[PDB]
Write a protein that binds this DNA or RNA. Structure first.
Lengths: 49, 1049, 139, 147
RNA sequence: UCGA
């Protein structure tokens, strides 16, 4: 389906969505937006333990 | 070139960094003024080294050079010039790969990222009140200027200590009342001038001394303020601190770099007052325009600066006690505090790290790491959520994917592919100019230094362009002021030069990166730096094309430089002749030991009589194939669950990977022994050792040392060493046993070097380093023997294997080829992977890789697919399914592609011969073999060594340690009913000198005894609390008796 | 070098070296050139207020020549989307300059919610991409 | 919510009045009780330095490459300008030059000082140093006396 | 520093 609306590293939802998925392939613009949530989900795991 | 932050930094130190440190140190004077000492820094020698690059690694030395400067010692009264070259210190040189050799071990210098010097303003709300603006003038070295602004128009200056009024500092530096208000709006400054008095030029130095140093002195107030910001060799803004002052405050003067100008303090107050008038920009601490990086050329400049300051105290303490003349200038300079300053930075500092040399990918990555820790950076406890996240200014400079997971999640970054650091210490990214909707790809890039945020509009390298005409797309997504937007293509300014500009050099080796998740691409980049070099590597079929550039920049690939004709090629050297002393020899290393117990073997590639070009591969490395890099093998894979053998991330391989020497690596271990000097008697290496017969004295050459090429197993003797003893405290049992059969005990004790448990191999280097041979030895040693043992390890059950997409696993079963499933041509299946881990982790690119490598298997073409496309849905699915249709058009291969199920074929079972009910996806996967083998994880202990104080078992595999039963493990047994297991694990297994003897004697005899004694760790705590002044004791509550119990006695 | 929003700055010296300069005279004269020509607007009424100058070029004024009937008011703001007379529409919003070819100066309106703090005045000059208002809302 | 502009030019207001509700919160606020529409006209905006003066008044036509703003650089209290090889200009208000001035660096005894050998058979030692400041009623030279 |  659709990837959705990702957010900033501070928490602000960007108005530019990611209309593709992991089968169609993301763009270079849609890859750095998805990296904001992957880094946020990574550093929140280490502080959770 | 990918290594420019290490080569250009050490080149700047050898011509600009070392000259600037010696020019500021010179000249020096005495207390009276009799003689003066000044150096000539721009004429140093930098003589030849002592040992070779490979010789310094085995001799336990450092590849260093001696530093000599000419020194002119002049005298004030009597005219005399004493010119003499004096030794300064030992400086380790950078090798051809960009590394240093310290004590025989290769080390790197990790680049550390810190804050840039300058003025930074920040809006701060301390409580629910008014808006307060702060300031911070950060220098390169010295004290800080922190200007704050409270409510009701009160601007204060804080110079760690209590704050003070702004008029106290502004008048003590030397100013008038009319020189302040003319360059200031002055109506806001009247509120802070009312409740501050109005001091004169001399009515402010006294009050400044009373609050900083709490009798005031008119001469003490000037010497205190000048030593903080105006004195040389105590306050430095730096070359980049002057650049940031003239940009933020917009100053006209420049090139000061030494003394803080008092006009700059007035400009920082004027920018702070105007922030309340809604004009001016608030700086960001996480912006890369405010964050600098430093390297070996800068970090060595601070170590000689603190090393020459220790030399200044001895040079001034020798020109005052010796009141006589006729003294040599070579005795005034003591090299001992400066030698120990350089040796502390390269061997004892945290930022000089142990180099990872598993494969050439980890060697290239470790020289480009960007860590935020070090002596002057950050702390592991002071790191927060904002410093570990990704800033929007990291686009193309720092890799957002490659970072280690766990504790250092975000603090240790990696440099990107096209990133470059200038002379000021800022990361730059190349960009192509776009003029009227046309990418000008004709000239050199611009290399913007992160100034495209508030001024320029930057498009990434993903937009469809035409052939020099225009841009195809009508809506171009750009980034402007750290926000993404889609504007017209005629309004853009710059465009990226490559789609791999964001990712690093290790993330770029992953094909189909856009189809994988960002969490699994983090793991796929880390597992690629742990792959062992195999015996015969193979190039990938779905490679990205960047493997050829990373192999040449690693330094382990012999390249040509002469454009000549190859004459002689053997397994040790390659001899060519240069043309437009004409016979150069390229040496080839054969099976050299690495830092991570791997091989560094090089193999010849060229033949005799072949034209070469500058930049051609002459001899590839261990983990390098012809030209490109090769870290694994291309073998068949199938995504099907077996009978529980691939249940939870487990790997099922075949027996064909064992006898074909697939995933077979060579590991070379190194052992160490030393014949030290015992004060009872000198130790020597003999062959006739006591209590060892002919079962272990077969490989010795009547010298106590083994020969070359002897197969050693677990429990042998490498070096037979004896040690004299002087105990003479024999028990009465041993005196009666010896008196019967004779055989009186000798005065020596067997201390022979032995092979540890689970270790075997073939001895390849038995190099012995003794005295009177031309090498230096440590004190308290007579003979140093070094043994190198090489072994050939195959792939077994329990080893950790992984791919390029984060699909790690551990092999649990090796099946024969008749039990594995087979393709309809009769070819069996190597790996039977589990398809359940694919859709839960979004590993889609590993399905695109195996389906494309299977198309390249039947064709033999070795595709090179760059990441981050082209037409949508026409570049990944129809590329794979279109090339699989071309492989099915061959008359011999009609079973490769099917019309109903495209990426699937019919697989037959190997045990029963019946086909499966559903078609299975097959393909050629590229798997790697990691360093986490099953041999390094085996540890067991019955009874070994014990601790020094608590008398508990030790911990470690190399010293026969025991497993720790921590506090979370006690809570599980306390939640159980296991009270007797908990008392056994705490008393008879640890910290009891009496209970361990009776428990071990009970098992051998066969009758166990209950009631263990008091543990030793409680009696240590009892004596420690009594030494703190606390009368703590244990009593008995028995009938009419309250007596203290003696737990120790 | 100067920025793109600044313009072209020149350096010229009125007097040479080795002369008799009177006290209270000019020494250097640095002038600022103009990229595009037009009519200077947005002059400040108060003295000693020189921060930025406006240069309305020829491309900033769109001319629309309708043949049916010119129906416009002096000082009226036209929003693109409405129809003046039946038979023609609009494509660019802005203000009208002259009252048959009606020229339109290009502009873009912005709606401000009531109760919001603004950081702009009436009659000043703005740049491309600066903060103007601060809209407040409840969520 | 930050609302940034897209074009540059003159700011025009439509049915929006400002209000000064000054309180002890931040002491710099301006709210609008009736928020209407704000308009931004078109035109190129060129910023000026704070020391420059605008020589073009309102409703004046400009040409391509003409003069827009001339900076008035007036340095009073100076009569003679002197420069050989430098970047910043320097003006000199007073200059003195005594007759028969001949200095010589004949200081073989101790430290190097420029002894002024004038035509009146006098040797003046330069007590002042090249590079330091001098004030009113200061010592600049001192002659050597055999008596 | 690196694995879970």
């Amino acid at each position: 389906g659709m990837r959705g609306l990702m957010a900033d590293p501070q928490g602000e939802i960007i108005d530019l969505p990611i209309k593709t998925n992991f089968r169609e392939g993301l763009t270079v613009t849609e890859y750095v937006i998805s990296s904001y949530g992957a880094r946020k989900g990574l550093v929140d795991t280490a502080l959770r333990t | 070139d990918l290594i420019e932050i290490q080569h250009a930094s050490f080149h700047w130190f050898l011509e600009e960094g070392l000259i600037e440190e010696l020019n500021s140190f010179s000249p020096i004077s005495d207390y009276t003024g009799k003689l003066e000492l000044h150096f000539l820094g721009k004429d140093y020698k930098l003589k030849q080294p002592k040992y070779d690059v490979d010789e310094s690694k085995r001799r336990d030395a450092s590849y260093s050079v001696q530093m000599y400067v000419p020194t002119r010692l002049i005298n004030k009264e009597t005219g005399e010039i004493k010119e003499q070259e004096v030794f300064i210190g030992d400086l380790p040189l950078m090798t051809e790969r960009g590394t240093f050799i310290i004590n025989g071990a290769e080390r790197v210098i990790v680049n550390q990222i810190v804050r840039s010097p300058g003025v930074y303003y920040k809006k701060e709300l301390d409580k629910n009140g008014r808006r307060t603006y702060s300031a911070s003038l950060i220098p390169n070295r010295g004290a800080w200027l922190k200007f704050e602004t409270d409510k009701n128009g009160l601007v204060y200056v804080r110079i760690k200590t209590r704050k003070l009024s702004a008029q106290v500092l502004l008048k003590a530096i030397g100013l008038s009342d009319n020189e302040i208000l003319d360059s200031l709006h002055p109506e806001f400054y009247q509120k802070t001038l009312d409740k501050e008095g109005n001091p004169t030029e001399e009515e402010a130095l006294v009050e400044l001394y009373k609050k900083l140093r709490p009798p005031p002195t008119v001469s003490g107030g000037q010497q205190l303020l000048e030593s903080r910001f105006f004195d040389p060799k105590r306050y430095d803004l730096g070359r980049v601190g002057r650049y940031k002052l003239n940009k933020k405050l917009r100053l006209n003067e420049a090139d000061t770099t030494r003394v803080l100008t008092p006009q700059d303090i007035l400009a920082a107050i004027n920018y702070l007052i105007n922030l309340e008038f809604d004009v001016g920009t608030t700086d960001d601490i996480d912006h890369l325009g405010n964050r600098r990086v430093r390297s070996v050329g800068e970090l060595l400049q601070n170590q000689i600066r603190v090393g020459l300051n220790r030399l200044e105290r001895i040079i001034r303490e020798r020109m005052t006690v010796s009141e006589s003349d006729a003294l040599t200038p070579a005795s005034l300079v003591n090299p001992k505090p400066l030698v120990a300053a350089i040796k502390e930075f390269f061997g004892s500092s945290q930022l000089s790290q142990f180099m990872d040399q598993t494969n050439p990918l980890a060697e290239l990555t470790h020289k480009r790491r960007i860590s935020a820790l070090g002596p002057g950076g950050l702390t592991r406890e002071r790191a927060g959520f904002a410093v570990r996240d990704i800033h929007p200014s990291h686009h193309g400079r720092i890799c957002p994917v490659e970072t280690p997971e766990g504790p250092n999640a975000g603090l240790i970054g990696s440099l990107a592919t096209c990133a470059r650091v200038n002379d000021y210490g800022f990361i730059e990214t190349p960009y192509f100019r776009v003029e009227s909707g046309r990418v000008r790809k004709d000239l050199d890039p611009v290399y913007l230094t992160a100034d495209e945020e508030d001024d320029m509009r930057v498009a990434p390298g993903d937009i469809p362009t035409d052939e020099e005409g225009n841009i195809i797309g009508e809506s171009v997504p750009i980034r402007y002021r750290q926000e993404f937007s889609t504007t017209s293509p005629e309004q853009v300014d710059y465009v990226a030069v490559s789609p791999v500009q964001i990712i690093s050099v290790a993330t770029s080796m992953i094909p189909f990166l856009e189809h994988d998740d960002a969490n699994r691409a983090l793991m796929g980049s880390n597992m690629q730096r742990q792959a062992v070099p195999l015996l015969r590597p193979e190039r990938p079929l779905v490679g990205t094309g960047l493997e050829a550039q990373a192999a040449r920049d690693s330094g382990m690939v012999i390249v040509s430089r002469t454009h000549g004709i190859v004459t002689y090629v053997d397994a040790t050297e390659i001899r060519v002749q240069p043309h437009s002393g004409e016979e150069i020899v390229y040496p080839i290393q054969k099976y050299q030991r690495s830092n991570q117990d791997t091989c560094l073997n090089q193999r010849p590639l060229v033949y005799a009589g072949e034209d070469v070009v500058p930049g051609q591969v002459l001899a590839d490395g261990s983990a390098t194939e012809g030209g490109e890099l090769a870290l694994g093998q291309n073998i068949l894979v199938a995504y099907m669950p077996w009978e529980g053998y691939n249940y939870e991330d487990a790997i099922l391989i075949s027996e064909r990977l064992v006898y074909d020497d697939v995933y077979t690596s060579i590991h070379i271990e190194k052992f160490e022994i030393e014949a030290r000097q015992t004060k009872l008697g000198p130790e020597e290496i003999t062959r006739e050792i006591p209590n060892v017969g002919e079962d272990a004295l077969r490989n010795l050459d009547e010298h106590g040392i083994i020969r070359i090429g002897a197969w050693v197993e677990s429990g042998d003797i490498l070096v037979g060493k004896v040690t004299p003893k002087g105990e003479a405290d024999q028990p009465p049992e041993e005196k009666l046993l010896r008196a019967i059969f004779g055989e009186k005990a000798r005065d020596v004790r067997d201390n022979s070097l032995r092979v540890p448990n689970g270790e075997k191999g073939r001895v390849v280097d038995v190099r012995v380093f003794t005295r009177e041979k031309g090498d230096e030895l440590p004190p308290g040693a007579n003979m140093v023997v070094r043994i190198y043992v090489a072994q050939k390890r195959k792939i077994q059950v329990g080893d950790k294997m992984a791919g390029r997409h984060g699909n790690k696993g551990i092999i649990s079963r090796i099946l024969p080829i008749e039990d594995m499933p087979y393709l309809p041509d009769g070819r069996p299946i190597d790996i039977a992977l589990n398809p359940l881990g694919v859709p839960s982790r979004m590993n889609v690119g590993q399905v695109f890789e195996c389906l494309l490598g299977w198309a390249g298997e039947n064709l033999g073409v070795r595709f090179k697919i760059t990441p981050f496309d082209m037409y949508g849905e026409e570049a990944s699915r129809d590329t794979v399914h279109g090339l699989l249709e071309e492989a099915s058009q061959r008359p011999n291969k009609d079973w490769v592609f099917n019309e109903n199920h495209p990426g699937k074929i019919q697989v037959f079972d190997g045990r029963t011969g019946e086909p499966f009910d559903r078609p299975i996806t097959v393909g050629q996967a590229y798997m790697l073999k990691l360093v986490h083998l099953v041999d390094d994880k085996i540890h067991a202990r019955s009874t070994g060594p014990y601790s020094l104080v608590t008398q508990q078992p030790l911990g470690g595999k190399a010293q026969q340690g025991g497993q720790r039963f921590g506090e979370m493990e006690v809570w599980a047994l306390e939640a159980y009913g296991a009270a007797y297991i908990l008392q056994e694990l705490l008393t008879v297994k640890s910290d009891d000198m009496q209970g361990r003897n009776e428990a071990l004697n009970a098992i051998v005899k066969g009758k166990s005894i209950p009631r263990p004694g008091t543990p030793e760790s409680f009696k240590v705590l009892m004596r420690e609390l009594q030494s703190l002044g606390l009368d703590i004791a244990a009593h008995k509550v028995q009938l009419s008796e309250d007596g203290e119990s003696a737990d120790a006695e | 070098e100067s920025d793109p929003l600044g313009g072209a700055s020149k350096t010229r010296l009125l007097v040479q070296d080795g002369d008799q300069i009177p006290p209270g005279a000019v020494v250097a004269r640095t002038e600022i050139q103009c990229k595009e020509a037009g009519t200077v607007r947005g002059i400040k009424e108060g003295q000693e207020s020189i921060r930025r100058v406006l240069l309305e070029r020829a491309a900033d004024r769109l001319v629309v020549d309708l043949p049916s009937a010119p129906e416009v008011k002096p000082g009226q703001l036209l929003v693109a989307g409405q129809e003046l007379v039946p038979g023609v529409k609009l494509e660019e919003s802005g203000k009208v300059l002259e009252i048959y070819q009606l020229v339109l100066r290009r502009a873009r309106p912005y709606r401000v919610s009531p109760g919001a703090v603004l950081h702009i005045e009436d009659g000043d000059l703005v740049q491309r991409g600066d903060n103007l208002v601060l809209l407040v809302f409840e969520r | 919510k930050d609302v940034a502009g897209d074009l540059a030019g003159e700011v025009l207001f439509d049915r929006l009045v400002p209000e000064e509700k000054t309180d002890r919160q931040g002491n710099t606020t301006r709210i609008a009780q009736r928020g209407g529409l704000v308009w931004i006209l078109s035109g190129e905006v060129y910023n000026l330095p704070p020391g420059a003066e605008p020589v073009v008044k309102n409703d004046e036509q400009v040409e391509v490459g003409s003069i827009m703003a001339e900076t008035k650089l007036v340095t009073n209290d100076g009569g003679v300008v002197r420069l050989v090889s430098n970047r910043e200009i320097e003006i000199i208000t007073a200059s003195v030059l005594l007759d028969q001035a001949q200095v010589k660096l004949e200081s073989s005894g101790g430290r190097e000082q420029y002894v002024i050998y004038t035509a009146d058979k006098q040797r003046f030692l330069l007590k002042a140093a090249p590079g330091t400041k001098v004030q009113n009623h200061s010592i600049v030279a001192e002659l050597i006396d055999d008596r």
